Amino acid sequence: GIAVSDDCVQKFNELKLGHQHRYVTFKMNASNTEVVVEHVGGPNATYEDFKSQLPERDCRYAIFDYEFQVDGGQRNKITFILWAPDSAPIKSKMMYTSTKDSIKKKLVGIQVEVQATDAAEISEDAVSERAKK
Numbered sequence: 001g002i003a004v005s006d007d008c009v010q011k012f013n014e015l016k017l018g019h020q021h022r023y024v025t026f027k028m029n030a031s032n033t034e035v036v037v038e039h040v041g042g043p044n045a046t047y048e049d050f051k052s053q054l055p056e057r058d059c060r061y062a063i064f065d066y067e068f069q070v071d072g073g074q075r076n077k078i079t080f081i082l083w084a085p086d087s088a089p090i091k092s093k094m095m096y097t098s099t100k101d102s103i104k105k106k107l108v109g110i111q112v113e114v115q116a117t118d119a120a121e122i123s124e125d126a127v128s129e130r131a132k133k
Contacts, residue, residue: 002028002099004035004106011037012107014090015065016078020067023050026061026103028095035061035103047124057087059096061103066112066131077131079112080104086117 014020023041038060039086041049046058052061069075082100084093104110116122
């Protein structure tokens with residue numbers, strides 16, 4: 001029911017098609033009618049730059065273009081992150097849970113999916129483990 005704004009796609013395509021952003025975060029608009037862009041990370045922005053601003057008691061969506069080395073060769077995984085901390089209100093968790101397939105399906109090209117409910121789960125450690133396979 002919640003719609004996904006076109007700009008969501010648009011920033012996503014920048015990250016994906018032109019490697020313009022390291023990550024894009026998405027949140028429910030004030031009206032709870034659409035999913036909108038929260039933060040755009042620049043191309044050299046860090047993992048900590050993303051993870052540190054995640055709200056302790058609210059949910060978020062994100063796309064992190066996760067980069068790593070396999071035998072010294074460069075690798076990239078477009079990773080889709082569902083942030084849904086245990087402390088977020090029921091209303092919050094229900095809204096993002098119901099809208100996740102819609103956003104994901106519009107964000108063509110997702111290679112890896114992570115769901116995290118706390119600090120260990122959204123750690124770089126846990127996310128790269130998933131990203132490297």
